[PDB]
Amino acid sequence: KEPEQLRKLFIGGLSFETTDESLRSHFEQWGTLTDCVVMRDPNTKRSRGFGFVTYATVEEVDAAMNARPHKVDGRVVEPKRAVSREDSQRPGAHLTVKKIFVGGIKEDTEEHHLRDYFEQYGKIEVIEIMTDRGSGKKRGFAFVTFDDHDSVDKIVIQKYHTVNGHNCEVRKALSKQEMASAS
DNA sequence: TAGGGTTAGGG
Numbered sequence: 001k002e003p004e005q006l007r008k009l010f011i012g013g014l015s016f017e018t019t020d021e022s023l024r025s026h027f028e029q030w031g032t033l034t035d036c037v038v039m040r041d042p043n044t045k046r047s048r049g050f051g052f053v054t055y056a057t058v059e060e061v062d063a064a065m066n067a068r069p070h071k072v073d074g075r076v077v078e079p080k081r082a083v084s085r086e087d088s089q090r091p092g093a094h095l096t097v098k099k100i101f102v103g104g105i106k107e108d109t110e111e112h113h114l115r116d117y118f119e120q121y122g123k124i125e126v127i128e129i130m131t132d133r134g135s136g137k138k139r140g141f142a143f144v145t146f147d148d149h150d151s152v153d154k155i156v157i158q159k160y161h162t163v164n165g166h167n168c169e170v171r172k173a174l175s176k177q178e179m180a181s182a183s
Numbered sequence: 184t185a186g187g188g189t190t191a192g193g194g
Binding site: 010014039051083093 | 184187188189190
């Protein structure tokens with residue numbers, strides 16, 4: 001079976017009325033749910049406005065994501081690939097972004113290399129192999145922009161990515177300022 | 184709209 005983390009989706013912006021039951025009832029329309037829950041406050045027991053649904057397979061998760069937008073209990077919710085508690089620590093881990101930072105690429109890396117690995121995740125909009133705007137020297141990293149934020153999410157939850165024959169690190173792209181605020 | 188008594192011992 002596939003890892004639990006990869007079979008689970010975070011569901012944000014849940015209506016105040018949504019319960020484990022109403023959530024399950026909606027998302028079961030795209031597969032077998034092995035888990036479904038609405039996070040509530042320990043004391044007040046009130047909904048925190050978000051939850052999680054987990055399918056028996058990633059194929060079902062993908063089906064659910066392909067079924068966006070999702071309206072549950074009259075409120076449009078925001079389903080996202082569940083990010084592990086560990087990665088949830090990294091800055092910007094939960095941002096809705098369409099661009100990824102690809103670091104550790106061989107100097108001879110060309111765009112076709114990036115396409116050959118990343119296209120399988122979604123429509124690529126822009127590819128930028130970074131160089132020093134002065135010496136023209138390759139800096140060893142690129143930026144790839146997709147059409148759907150879920151492409152980025154499907155990618156960053158994986159651990160390894162092979163580009164131009166060798167593994168590379170892929171994170172969500174932070175802005176010039178976000179980088180600063182994280183340093 | 185980021186997790187449910189779910190994260191470093193004791194030899």
